[PDB]
Amino acid sequence: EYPTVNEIPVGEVRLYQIADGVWSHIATQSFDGAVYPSNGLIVRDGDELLLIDTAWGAKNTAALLAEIEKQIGLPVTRAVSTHFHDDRVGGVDVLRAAGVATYASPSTRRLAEAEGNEIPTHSLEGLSSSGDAVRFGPVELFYPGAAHSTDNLVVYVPSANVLYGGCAVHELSSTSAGNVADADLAEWPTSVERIQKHYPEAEVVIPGHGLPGGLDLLQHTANVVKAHKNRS
Ligand SMILES: C[C@@H]1[C@H]([C@H](C(=O)O)[C@H](C)O)N=C(C(=O)O)[C@H]1S[C@@H]1CN[C@H](C(=O)N(C)C)C1
Ligand SMILES: [Zn+2]
Ligand SMILES: [Zn+2]
Ligand SMILES: [Zn+2]
């Protein structure tokens, strides 16, 4: 069973095998008095590991690195943050101090700076226009356009057909668009449509919070966001 917010204490981390050489990591964190789950990705890259997104905080991310070393035993050499919020860059100082080279789009780094969040060390060029993609180790990085945030990236693992949508993508049981404070609601459905068109062979889709599912999460996300728009 995929771990839920109830079976993970704030401070601990779970790994969940998605495919050969692909894992999700799940942590929990207390935000505005309530506890929420949060996903990231781990992708094997030969004898090294690529980390996608922190575990939402310094303490969680340290637990993440110890859990990875224990369970997988390969060094995390690089990490990518998929947008500027604290569930994606919270813990980047820990990663950096531990010798992990941390990456994000220039957009993410600028937004995190202005937000007072931790800032990834290196910039990812080539992701400024909607529809842009670059290769980064064993994955592709895709900027679908503004959605949950104006900078959000999605990550595809072509060898495993795994799409990590991050907070641009919602889990199937969710009916709310979640945190839309920094969202471009006008563009979010279109940005989702780009993901559908660019990665139609994705077999697993992982949201930024909640249970992974199939390709259905993408359309479901567009519906949730458009329902939110209409309600307003
Ligand atoms: C509290 C979080 C986290 C923080 C937030 O909302 O600000 C983050 C630090 O920005 N981001 C968030 C988001 O909407 O992306 C929310 S989680 C959201 C609430 N219900 C949804 C859900 O399906 N859950 C499994 C809990 C997702
Ligand atoms: Zn966010
Ligand atoms: Zn660079
Ligand atoms: Zn989030």
| CA atoms within a 13 Å half-sphere pointing along the CA-CB vector of 191 | 30
Q: Among candidates 111, 112, 109, 113, which has minimal Cα distance to 125?
A: 109
What is the position in ligand 1's atom list of the atom closest to the CA of 173?
Answer: 23
Of all protein residues, the one whose alpha carbon is nearest to atom 25 of ligand 1 is 210
* Active-site choice (179, 182, 184, 223): 179
CB of 209 shorter than 6 A to ligand 1: yes
Is 158 in a helix, a strand, or coil? coil
Q: How was this entry determined? A: X-ray
**Sheet harboring 204-207: ordered strands across?**
133-136, 139-142, 154-157, 162-166, 204-207
Q: Could you name the CATH architecture of 1-232?
A: 4-Layer Sandwich (3.60)
Could you tell me how many residues make up the chain? Answer: 232
Sequence-distant (6+) residues with CB within 8 A of 77 are 45, 48, 49, 50, 100, 101
Task: Report how far apart, in Å, the C-alpha atoms of 221 and of each of 53, 201, 217 are.
Answer: 20, 18, 6
CA separation for the pair 65, 73 (Å, rounded)? 10
DSSP state of 167: T
**Sheet harboring 22-31: ordered strands across?**
13-19, 22-31, 34-45, 48-52, 76-80, 101-104, 122-123
CA separation for the pair 187, 106 (Å, rounded)? 20
| CA atoms within a 13 Å half-sphere pointing along the CA-CB vector of 23 | 22
